[PDB]
Amino acid sequence: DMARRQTIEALVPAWDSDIIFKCLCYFHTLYPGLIPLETFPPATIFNFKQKIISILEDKKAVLRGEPIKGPLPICCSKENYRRHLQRTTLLPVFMWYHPTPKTLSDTMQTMKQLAIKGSVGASHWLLVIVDIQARRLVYFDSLYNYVMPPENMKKELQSFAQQLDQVYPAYDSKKFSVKIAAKEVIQRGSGSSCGAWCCQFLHWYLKDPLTDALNDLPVDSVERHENLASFVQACEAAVQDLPELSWPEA
């Protein structure tokens, strides 16, 4: 078991905001509907909702031929960002979480220090997929209930979905739906592999937006991380020669 954790940790080490971002850039070249939202800084539980609303309002503005009002990304040109906003059908909203800070501002501070220190601590990567095309919010927590009970997150996301219906109405009456992805702890036996898990789940979702991959995981915790290790190795080889901190063309 000490052996088991030591190997699960060795198999899949923590992913930082850069490898996640390079991964998103790469995923966009595979799936052009994915907009590679920056992870520097990522969203938080305290503002992921307004960030999503802001992105969708800018998407509406671009579709109308109008100026955008929301913030520009750091590593993207204005014009390429408008082209991504025009094109995108899926927002990969990575969220950085930690139980300690209880506000946005505190979260950003806690975030900053741990970066200069260089520590993972009890910080956690969450992923909210905003699938514009299917009108689906998917919430993925590789630790299952690290923020709150999933039944709670579902209710909170259902009310958020209701305002996304107002902000970003469909042609028809179709309402945003929500999916809580994980129904057990995915990250079994690791306290580090969340970032990789988020990207693996995102990739499975890009391949099949009705993916049951989580339900088809092997029961064994080491086998899960062996498979995840292979994915990680594939991602690192694929982004090896891709540009640092530079959005791909829409």
């Binding site: 923590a14 992913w15 930082d16 905001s17 590593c75 950003m108 975030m111 970066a115 993972v120």
Partner: protein, 75 residues
């Protein structure tokens, strides 16, 4: 020069520099005041990343410019 560097907590720190200064120099100036090692510093301007052996003038970075500082965060 009077320019601005924007951080991820929405804070901007101001530095006085000359265009003949290296990217290495900017990172050293930022380090003295916030303590982050240059090897940890990533500088962005007009959506371009600044390279260590270059000068501010190479990228035509002028007075009253706004710069971005990127942090590499763990989770």
């Amino acid at each position: 020069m009077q320019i601005f560097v924007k951080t991820l907590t929405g804070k901007t720190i101001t530095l006085e520099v000359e265009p003949s200064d290296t990217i290495e120099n900017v990172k050293a100036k930022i380090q003295d005041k916030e303590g982050i090692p240059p090897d940890q510093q990533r500088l962005i301007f007009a959506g371009k990343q600044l390279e260590d052996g270059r000068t501010l003038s190479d990228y035509n970075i002028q007075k009253e410019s706004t710069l971005h500082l990127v942090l590499r965060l763990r989770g």
